[PDB]
Amino acid sequence: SYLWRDSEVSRSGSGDEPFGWVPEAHSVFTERILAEEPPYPCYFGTQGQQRGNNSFSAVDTRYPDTHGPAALARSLRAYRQRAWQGPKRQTLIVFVGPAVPGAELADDHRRFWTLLDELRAYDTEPWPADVPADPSDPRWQWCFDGEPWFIFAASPAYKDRRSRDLGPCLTLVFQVRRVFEGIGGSTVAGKAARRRVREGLARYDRIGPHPTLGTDFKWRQYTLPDDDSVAAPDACPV
Ligand code: HEM
Ligand SMILES: NC(=[NH2+])NCCC[C@H](N)C(=O)O
Numbered sequence: 001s002y003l004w005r006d007s008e009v010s011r012s013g014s015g016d017e018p019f020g021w022v023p024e025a026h027s028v029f030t031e032r033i034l035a036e037e038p039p040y041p042c043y044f045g046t047q048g049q050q051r052g053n054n055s056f057s058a059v060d061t062r063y064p065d066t067h068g069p070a071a072l073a074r075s076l077r078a079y080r081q082r083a084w085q086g087p088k089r090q091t092l093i094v095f096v097g098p099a100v101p102g103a104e105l106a107d108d109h110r111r112f113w114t115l116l117d118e119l120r121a122y123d124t125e126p127w128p129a130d131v132p133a134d135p136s137d138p139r140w141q142w143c144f145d146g147e148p149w150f151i152f153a154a155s156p157a158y159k160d161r162r163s164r165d166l167g168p169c170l171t172l173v174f175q176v177r178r179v180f181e182g183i184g185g186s187t188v189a190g191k192a193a194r195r196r197v198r199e200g201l202a203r204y205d206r207i208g209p210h211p212t213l214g215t216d217f218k219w220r221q222y223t224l225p226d227d228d229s230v231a232a233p234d235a236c237p238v
Contacts, residue, residue, distance in 0.1 A: 001074070001075070001078060002019075002057050002058065002067075002071055002072075002074075002075050003055055003056075003057055003075045003078045003079055003082070003092075004055065004056045004057065005052065005055060005056075006026075006030075006052065006054070006056075009022060009023055009026045009056055010023050012058060018060045018062070018063050018066070018067045019058050019060055019067065021095075021097045021098045021099065021169075022056075022058045022095055022097070025058075025095040025097060025099075025167050025168065025169050025171075026056060026095070028166075028167035028168065029093060029095075029166050029167050029171065030049060032165075032166055032167065033045050033046050033049050033166075034046060034049060034050070038200070038203045038204050039200060039203075039204075040163070040200070040204070041163045041197055041198075041200030041201045041203075041204045041205070042163070042197055042200070043196060043197070043200065044089060044179075044193070044197075045091065047089070048089050048090065048091050051087065051089075053087045053089055053090045053091070054090070054091050054092075054093060055079055055082060055090065055091070055092050055093070056092070056093050056094070056095070057072060057075040057076075057079070057092065057093075057094045057095075058094060058095045058096070058097065059071075059072055059094065059095075059096045059097075059115065060097065060098070061096065061097070061098070062098070068118075069115060069118035069119050069121075069122060070122050072094065072115075072119065072122075073119055073122030073123065073124075073144075075092075075094075076092070076119070076144060076145060076174065077124070077145050079092045079174070080144075080145050080147070080176060083175070083176045083178065084176065084178060088178045088179060088181055088182075089179050090175070090176075090179065091173060091174070091175050091179070092173070092174040092175070093166075093171060093172070093173055093174075094171065094172040094173075094174065095167075095169045095170075095171055096111065096115065096169055096170040096171070096172065097168075097169040097170075098169075099156075099168035099169050103155075103156075103157060103170075104157055105155055105157035105158065105225070105226055107157075108153065108155035108157055108170045109153060109155075109223040110237075111170055112153040112170060112172065112222070112223060113223070113237040113238055115172070116142055116151070116238060117238055119144060120144075123144050123145060124145070125144075125145050125146040126146070127143055128143050128146060128147055128148060130148075131143050131148050135219065135236040135238045136233075136234040136236065138216035138217060138233070139216070140217075140218070140219060140236065141218050141219075142219070142222070142238070147176060147177070148177060149174055149175060149176060149177075150174070150175040150176075150177065150179070150180070151172060151173065151174050151175075151222055152164070152172075152173050152221065152222050152223075152224075153170065153171070153172060153173075153222060153223050154166035154167075154170070154171040154172075154173060155170050155171070156168050156169075157226070158226055159206070159226060160205065160206035160207040160226050160227065161205055161206075161207055161210075161224060161226050162204060162205050162206065163201060163204055163205050164224065185214075185215075207226070207227065207228070210224045210225070210228070211228065211230055212224070212230060212231075216233070217233040217236075219236040219238075220233070220236075
């Protein structure tokens with residue numbers, strides 16, 4: 001099992017072994033989201049970390065047959081079970097490494113989509129009936145193990161949208177929809193939540209919230225650009 005709680009991450013690997021770069025990635029990530037001043041903009045992520053509600057996994061690109069998408073599919077099935085028990089506000093953070101000096105943002109985004117595609121082959125459940133399977137559909141979302149997920153890519157190549165620089169690796173952030181229960185967009189609590197996060201972004205990032213955050217074409221939110229560019233709705237790369 002490559003699904004880890006905070007206390008388990010140190011045993012992922014040591015030195016040049018598979019996952020040997022993971023402990024440091026984990027520390028860098030926790031430093032970013034627990035930072036005092038300015039605070040990390042998403043206080044939900046900070047709270048989740050503080051409360052022990054974040055789990056972690058990794059992909060080691062050097063060893064795709066043993067530390068790659070097949071194993072991550074197992075980790076994600078295990079995570080999904082965990083995420084529906086106990087606290088609603090859990091996240092899985094998946095580091096993809098080793099880090100690649102000099103990678104550009106478009107490169108990390110390509111790697112992200114390729115990984116999502118590779119996972120589809122290892123899904124043991126049918127695609128959910130409530131979500132269209134066609135990625136050009138306005139209501140498409142990425143699904144796995146029987147349900148849609150919220151997922152986004154973090155990268156060190158986010159220079160202006162620093163909120164999405166979580167350390168030196170391409171980093172995937174996975175959540176089941178349960179996380180958002182009680183903070184839907186129409187709700188009083190949901191409007192408060194978005195206010196608070198956005199106020200945080202305005203003290204942290206060099207660029208404001210992206211227009212695609214605002215329902216349709218959620219895929220564009222997975223791989224925000226570092227600027228105000230807006231991708232074509234029917235151009236999801238999956
Ligand atoms: C480690 C965990 C998390 C990280 C790293 C994280 C990161 C972010 C980032 C960077 C944003 C800014 C928008 C974007 O880039 O997509 C954001 C927004 C947001 N996040 Fe978090 N998040 C985490 C966990 C959570 C959890 C558990 C919840 C809910 C319970 C949550 C709810 C929200 C909401 C409501 C917004 C505001 C969206 C908007 O203003 O449109 N996040 N998060
Ligand atoms: N990192 C983020 N943008 N978080 C908020 C995700 C919003 C989510 N798709 C929803 O429908 O409630």
